[PDB]
């Protein structure tokens, strides 16, 4: 029942090979709906979901204008951060920013976030009150001082608590077929001998949406966390997700092992058995 809107931005410098690469994507929950790529021909914010295509020319012009402004700010950032960290131009560096809002079952605001990373590590983030900052090291303290003096948090909070939530509701209504669905996992387990004395048991979940899911193995009711290989939830490419978890067990012991599947689409969590 709960929902989120998030925007993800990546800028990468490329020493002596021109301007930095800038990519922006927007999601509602686990469904992407817009992109911008600085290297592409169009130089436009572009639709990536059917239900956003109906937005009119003012939306696309304004979103293109705003995303280019974001691009330019991150361009400047890569130079500023090299100065903050006393880094040279021999190497490529990466800035990432992500922000957005969560709402619960009733579509009321839960929480907002606005986070920045440099070279894969936290740099600065708005705290949960949306009134103050968490700066991860001394260079980020410089940014904190500047963003406090410029009252950045107040502008962000107004967006995250208000504007962000309003667009999320709009998207949820316009894309209701896609966005307000839940596809329960189709589940099964597979068994394959790896030798005359051991077998791999793999628990599958297919064709589910949203992506959040939990798959766990038990042996006589005891969790087998340290012995489980759990892969990252992966897209099928049709708007649904897949995931598996495996254990390697002594042949003959299969009936001790059970797979447990939890997903919001299931009316009850499933236990799959070998008997």
């Amino acid at each position: 029942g709960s929902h989120s809107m998030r925007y993800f931005f990546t800028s990468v410098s490329r020493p002596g090979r021109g301007e930095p690469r800038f990519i922006a994507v927007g999601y509602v929950d686990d469904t992407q709906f817009v992109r911008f790529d600085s290297d592409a021909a169009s130089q436009r914010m572009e639709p990536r979901a059917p239900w956003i295509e109906q937005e009119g020319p003012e939306y696309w012009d304004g979103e293109t204008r705003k995303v280019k402004a974001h691009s330019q700010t991150h361009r400047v950032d890569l130079g500023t951060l090299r100065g903050y960290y006393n880094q040279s131009e021999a190497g490529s560096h990466t800035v990432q920013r992500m922000y957005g809002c969560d709402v619960g079952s009733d579509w009321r605001f839960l929480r907002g976030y606005h986070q920045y990373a440099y070279d894969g590590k936290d740099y600065i983030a708005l705290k949960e009150d949306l009134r103050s900052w968490t700066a991860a090291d001394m260079a980020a303290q410089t940014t904190k001082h500047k963003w406090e003096a410029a009252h950045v948090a107040e502008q962000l909070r107004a967006y995250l608590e208000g504007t962000c939530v309003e667009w999320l509701r709009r998207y949820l209504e316009n894309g209701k077929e896609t966005l307000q669905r839940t596809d329960a996992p189709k589940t099964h387990m597979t068994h394959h001998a790896v030798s005359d004395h051991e077998a791999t048991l793999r628990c599958w979940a297919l064709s589910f949406y949203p992506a959040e899911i939990t798959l766990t193995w038990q042996r006589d009711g005891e969790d087998q966390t340290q012995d489980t290989e759990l892969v990252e939830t992966r897209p099928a490419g049709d708007g649904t997700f897949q995931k598996w978890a495996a254990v390697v067990v002594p042949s003959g012991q299969e009936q001790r092992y059970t797979c447990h599947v939890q997903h919001e689409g299931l009316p009850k969590p499933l236990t799959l058995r070998w008997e």
Partner: peptide, 9 residues
């Protein structure tokens, strides 16, 4: 839709 208020670090 995107935010505004995005300042340089």
């Amino acid at each position: 839709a995107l935010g505004i208020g995005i300042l340089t670090v």
